Design a protein around this ligand. Sequence first.
Ligand code: O40
Ligand code: O40
Lengths: 15, 15, 238, 235
Amino acid sequence: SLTERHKILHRLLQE
Amino acid sequence: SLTERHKILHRLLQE
Amino acid sequence: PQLSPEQLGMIEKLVAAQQQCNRRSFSDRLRVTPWPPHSREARQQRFAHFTELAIVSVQEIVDFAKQLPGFLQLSREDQIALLKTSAIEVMLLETSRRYNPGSESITFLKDFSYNREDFAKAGLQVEFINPIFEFSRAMNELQLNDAEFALLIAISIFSADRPNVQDQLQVERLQHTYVEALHAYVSIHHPHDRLMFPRMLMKLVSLRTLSSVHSEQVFALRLQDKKLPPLLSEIWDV
Amino acid sequence: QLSPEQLGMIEKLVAAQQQCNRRSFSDRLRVTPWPSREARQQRFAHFTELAIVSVQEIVDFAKQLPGFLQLSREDQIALLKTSAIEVMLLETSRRYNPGSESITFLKDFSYNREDFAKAGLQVEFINPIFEFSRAMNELQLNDAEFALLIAISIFSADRPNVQDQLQVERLQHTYVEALHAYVSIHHPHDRLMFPRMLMKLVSLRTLSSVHSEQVFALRLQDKKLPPLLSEIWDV
Ligand SMILES: CCCc1c(OCCCN(C)C(=O)Nc2ccc(C(=O)O)cc2)ccc2c(C(F)(F)F)noc12
Ligand SMILES: CCCc1c(OCCCN(C)C(=O)Nc2ccc(C(=O)O)cc2)ccc2c(C(F)(F)F)noc12
């Protein structure tokens, strides 16, 4: 998945 | 110039 | 958006210019090397075939641009600058025009349709093939007629932001007249859908990205030591 | 014909952008200042940290976009990964100073083509950034237009790896329609302004590609991007 390869972006989105 | 480097295209334009 | 006589005549001439450009290339398209089982020979003939379709397409694109109002008043230098970079976009547009949703194929020659596997066999990489057919799928949903394609093509050609354009003011001014013409035309063809006009324009955005993917295709050919024929090499090779 | 719902949505976007600008004030204050190997590094660090803060604002702005958080997190990331740079270029062109041909990032500080090159970017990217900024400034967009163009850029159904293309497109179109209705009030005697704005989305795609070559040149030079920028931009 893209999600597993974009940890910092994923965390910014989660808050 | 672009023209000197595009001799076929140029000839197609001339007619 | 009020379609004027001047716009109406102009759209009709483009549509007639396109049809006239195509009959002019009927014979040259007749001597394209025929489309041929598992040999180096066979993959050269398919590549030869496809590239020769592209050669004639560029001939048509040039011919059509000559009939575009204001195009020939540009310097020949600006004319070459516009065509060098729009050609692939015009070709991708013409490709999407000939798309068959049912079989997800492209009909170039009349009794003969090409699917994703045929493109691969013709020498193209899947990273380019797949976006061509996706773009073609999306464009088919919009169901553009001759007039909307002719104008989309003209708008694509008159892009002030191509590399090496001198008279950016005038090229932009010319693009705007075809944008207005399209806006007015789409108001007759789709009078209850104010989204159809911007959706067409938005496809030019997708085209820019296909152009970029195409540049990567041309770069891969170099590494395959697969050489483009002279006209395609002149416009596409670095 | 601008409806109550469109007018309200446009105003929230504009409020959202200012709210996002506020929440990243402190982060922009802690960024390595603009200043050998030490000076060269510090400039690159200065620029890249501005980009990081900027990516954080774009993320925060996207979360405020109606429909964005209802897309899968996978699509959210899909959309943000490829539009980030286009949104950054739009923000760059917003801060263009025509008279000096410079970009005002931090408020007492303008950056020109020379400063960009000193920060570690190549001329093949810089000149296109400045040419686009020039063309963009002639349009004289306002907050509302910039915010809508940014939404439309984010809701691009044709990005790589988008699953719910239908929904992304459907959302984009609400912003296109709102922009059209809005531009008819702001420019009631010029029906070209609306399409001219959408054609800047075309230019941004090319600039996005010229940016990919810039990211590639950094590989060759072994100038590594910090982690957030590397995650979104590196192959
Ligand atoms: C596909 C993307 C463009 C494209 C090609 O197009 C071949 C197809 C060109 N074309 C639009 C066309 O032929 N139209 C067309 C009209 C009327 C009739 C008719 O009336 O019979 C028949 C045909 C061929 C080769 C290449 C390459 C590379 F060179 F790198 F391989 N890169 O991009 C390419
Ligand atoms: C320009 C191209 C984008 C860009 C960068 O942007 C630096 C600038 C980012 N930016 C748009 C921004 O900061 N805006 C901004 C808003 C508000 C305020 C404020 O309110 O004070 C201040 C500033 C920095 C590094 C790179 C690189 C690479 F690293 F690959 F070289 N590629 O592209 C880059």
